[PDB]
C-alpha cells in the first residue's frame, strides 16, 4: 500500500521507530515477447507431398 506498510511487514511490527529501518525492495519493470527466432532460414518441401 505505502512505504510505511512495506517496512512494517519486514520489521514484523506495526510500530516503526525513527530512522531508515528498512531498505524495502528494488525497482523492476515487466515485459513480454515471443520465441523461436529465426524463420527465413529455409522453406519446406511439404508441397511436394500434397
Amino acid at each position: 500500500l505505502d512505504p510505511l506498510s512495506e517496512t512494517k511487514c519486514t520489521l514484523k511490527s506495526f510500530t516503526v521507530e525513527k530512522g531508515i529501518y528498512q531498505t524495502s525492495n528494488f525497482r523492476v519493470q515487466p515485459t513480454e515477447s515471443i520465441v523461436r527466432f529465426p524463420n527465413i532460414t529455409n522453406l519446406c518441401p511439404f508441397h511436394e507431398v500434397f
Binding site: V16, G19, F26, R27, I40
Partner: protein
C-alpha cells in the same frame, strides 16, 4: 529470445566486433552483454532494465506517519516509478510527484524538503545529507540537510599570547561497556 537464449533487458545496438563464429557475448562476469540477430547481423547489447534499490525513511510512528523515500544510487532524471498505474505490478506504491525532490550523491530523495540550515545529523541517509521531522517549516515535515560537523571556532594564535585557566570544574562522565553475554545451551536432538 533469439536462438534459445531467453532474458530481459534493453537493446542498444553496439558495434561490438562479433566474428562470423560468434553469436552470443558474455562479459567479464560470465554475464550476457551482447547478442546477434538470428536473421540479420545487427549486434545488440543487452543492457539491464530499470533497476534500483529503495530505502524508506520514516520518523517515529508515534510522532507521525509522513515518510520519505530514497532511490539509492539513482539520478532523479531517471524513471523512479513514473507509471500510469498499468506498467509494473510489484511496486504499485507510487511516489512519482510531490514537488519535493533533492538529488544527492547517494540517490534521489523524495518526500523531504532540502534546507540550507545545517543541524546535527539525526537520521543518516548518506553523502552528508541527513533527515529529520523538524517542526520549523509553523508546520512540521521531513527535511534534509548537510550534517553539521560542529560549532565553528578559531584560536588567535600569536607568537607571544598564552592562555592560563583561572578556575576548574570536576566533571563526572559515564561509560558503559558490555562484559558478559547470555550463556546458552542447545540439545541437538531435541531441537
Amino acid at each position: 529470445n533469439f536462438n534459445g537464449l531467453t532474458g530481459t533487458g534493453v537493446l542498444t545496438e553496439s558495434n561490438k566486433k562479433f566474428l562470423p563464429f560468434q553469436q552470443f557475448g558474455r562479459d567479464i562476469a560470465d554475464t550476457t552483454d551482447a547478442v546477434r540477430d538470428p536473421q540479420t547481423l545487427e549486434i545488440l547489447d543487452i543492457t539491464p532494465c530499470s533497476f534500483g534499490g529503495v530505502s524508506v525513511i520514516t520518523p517515529g510512528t508515534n510522532t507521525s506517519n509522513q515518510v520519505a523515500v530514497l532511490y539509492q544510487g539513482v539520478n532523479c532524471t531517471e524513471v523512479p516509478v513514473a507509471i500510469h498505474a498499468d506498467q509494473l505490478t510489484p511496486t504499485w506504491r507510487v511516489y512519482s510527484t510531490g514537488s519535493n525532490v533533492f538529488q544527492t550523491r547517494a540517490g534521489c530523495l523524495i518526500g523531504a524538503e532540502y534546507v540550507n540550515n545545517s543541524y546535527e545529523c539525526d537520521i543518516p541517509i548518506g553523502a552528508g545529507i541527513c533527515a529529520s521531522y523538524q517542526t520549523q517549516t509553523a508546520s512540521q515535515s521531513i527535511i534534509a540537510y548537510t550534517m553539521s560537523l560542529g560549532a565553528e571556532n578559531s584560536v588567535a594564535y600569536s607568537n607571544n599570547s598564552i592562555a592560563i585557566p583561572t578556575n576548574f570544574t570536576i566533571s563526572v562522565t559515564t561509560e558503559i561497556l558490555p562484559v558478559s553475554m547470555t550463556k546458552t545451551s542447545v540439545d541437538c536432538t531435541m531441537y
